[PDB]
Structures are given as C-alpha cells and as structure tokens.
Amino acid sequence: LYTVKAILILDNDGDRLFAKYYDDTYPSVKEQKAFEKNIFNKTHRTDSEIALLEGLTVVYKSSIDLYFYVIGSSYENELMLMAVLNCLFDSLSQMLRKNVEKRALLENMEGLFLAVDEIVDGGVILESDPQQVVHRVAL
Template sequence: MLDGLTCVYRSNVDLFFYVMGSSQENELILMSVLNCLYDSVSQILRKNVEKRAVLDSLDIVMLAMDEICDGGIIIDADPNSVVSRVALRNDDIPLGEQTVAQVIQSAKEQLKWSLLK
C-alpha cells in the first residue's frame, strides 16, 4: 500500500516498473498487468530491457502501455497480442515518403483492424 493505493513493482537492471490501483483492487490482476507490460517491453526491445533502450524506444513503449490499459481500465493482458498491435511492420514506409493515398489506405486498414478486434 502506498498512500492508500495498491502498488506492485518489478525491477530490472536500472529500471523499475510500477502498476498502481485502488486499495480494493486485486493484487493478482495488477500483477498480470505488470507482467504483460514487462513482457511486452521485453519483446519490443528484444530482451534488452535497460533504461537507454527504453528511452530510445519510448514512443512504442508508451503505445504498448496504452494498448494494455486505457483510462484505468485493463484492455489486454496478453503480451503477444499487445506486441502484435504495436510492432512496426517491415514494409512500413516513413510517413514523409508516403503519398496521400497511401496514408489514407493505411488509416483505413488500421481502423478496420481496430474495429474487428
């Protein structure tokens, strides 16, 4: 308990991962969210979970956090599912090099997949 909140954490080399919930929240649920976050970050960074690597890839790490939890509501606790949604595809073209039609098509596909899940 920390200021009336339930807190679970996990440490690694030079990082600490924290998940906090209300005092009535089940610690096992919070732990599953924490494990999902850590495993997702580990897969995204290819097992190199260190401060420098996280800072270099902070945008995708934050996106993974957003896929796991939104507004305090747990959306997904499966690291493979989270990684598949946030992973950059190899065939992606940098946004500056895409035509307007390609950007619109990409947005349509992203919207379609988000609605199907």
C-alpha cells in the same frame, strides 16, 4: 476500472520518464515528484513483493535498470494486477527481443508509449497479455 492513478516508469534516480496519470485528481508536477519522492526515496530501487501505500495498492517493480510504478487501489487483487505489470515487462522484452534498460529507454520512448496505450487506457485495463498485441502490433 478507470483505476490507474498513474502508471509511471520511473527512473530510479526518482525520475520519471513516463507517467501517465491515467486517472488523476491530484496534480502538480512537483507534487507528483514529491509524492514520488517519499515513496521512491524510501523504496529506493528496492520494491516489495507487495506494497500498499495509501490503502491503495502500489505495485511497483524494478527491472535490472528501471523502476516501475503502478499506482492503484488496494481494492483490486494482486494477481491480476501484477499480471498486467508482468505483461509489461515480458512483452517488451520478447517483442523487442529486449526488455527495459536505461539505454533502451534513452534510444526511443515511443514503443513504450505505443504499447501502453494499447494495454491500458486510463483507469480501465483494456488488456494484460502479450500475444494479441503481438499480432496486433506490427510496427
């Protein structure tokens, strides 16, 4: 619910190759990096089952190559929240026939992008399951 501070897909070199601040109210590319730094540096590819930072939900994940960040508020249950996060790995994996890689990332961004807008759009998750998508999309 207009609830994504950003969803970022971050490299684990603290880099971010995706960020959409769906919702935002703080700025700076730097501060974004800084903010990123404290937490990323700290989580350092390691993640947690759950993590709350800022009273805010941090659901983040890692892949086998990439670090997934979503920032949200601990003010909206894990199970769902994760479900979207889950949705993110999985569909990308199946559809593409391949999940995220650094390589994958490097060849083309777009698909992520395409997906992303569809799934979520700002601080409101319009959707969180693949299938609909799968049919819906045909690129």
